[PDB]
Amino acid sequence: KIHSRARGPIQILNRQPMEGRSRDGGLRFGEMERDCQIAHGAAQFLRERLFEASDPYQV
């Protein structure tokens, strides 16, 4: 069950971390977590987790 990830592989459809230890996937920052960090007022953390640490992109 021990699992860790730091700049690992990503999916093809969306450039987000994979799912599962077998694929070296990342952990899910679900909606409930987005709501919790919103209460804390932590916007930078919510940005770093959902944008910079999951799938940063430029268009």
Partner 1 sequence: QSLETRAEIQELAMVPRMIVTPQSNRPVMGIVQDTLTAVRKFTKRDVFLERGEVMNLLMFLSTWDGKVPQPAILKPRPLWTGKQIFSLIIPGHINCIRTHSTHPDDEDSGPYKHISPGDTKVVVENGELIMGILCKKSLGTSAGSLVHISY
Partner 2 sequence: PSNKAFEKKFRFDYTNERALRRTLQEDLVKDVLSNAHIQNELEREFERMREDREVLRVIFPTGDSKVVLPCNLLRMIWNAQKIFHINPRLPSDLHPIKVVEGVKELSKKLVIVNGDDPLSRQAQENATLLFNIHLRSTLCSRRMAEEFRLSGEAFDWLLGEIESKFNQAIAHPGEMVGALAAQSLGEPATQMTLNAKNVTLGVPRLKELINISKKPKTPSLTVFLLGQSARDAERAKDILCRLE
Partner 3 sequence: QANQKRITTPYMTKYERARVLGTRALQIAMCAPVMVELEGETDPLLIAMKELKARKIPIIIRRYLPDGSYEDWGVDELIISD
Binding residues vs partner 1 (CB under 8 A): 37, 40-42, 44-45, 48, 52-53
Interatomic CA distance for residues 40 and 36, integer angstroms? 7
Site for partner 2 in 4-33 (CB under 8 A): none
- Write down the least CB distance from residue 55 to partner 1, Å: 15
- What is the C-alpha to C-alpha distance for residues 31 and 47, in angstroms, rounded to an integer? 13
14 binds partner 3 (CB under 8 A): no
User: Which of 56, 58, 59 is closest to 15 using CA atoms?
Assistant: 56
Chain residues in the site for partner 2 (CB under 8 A):
35-36, 38-39, 41
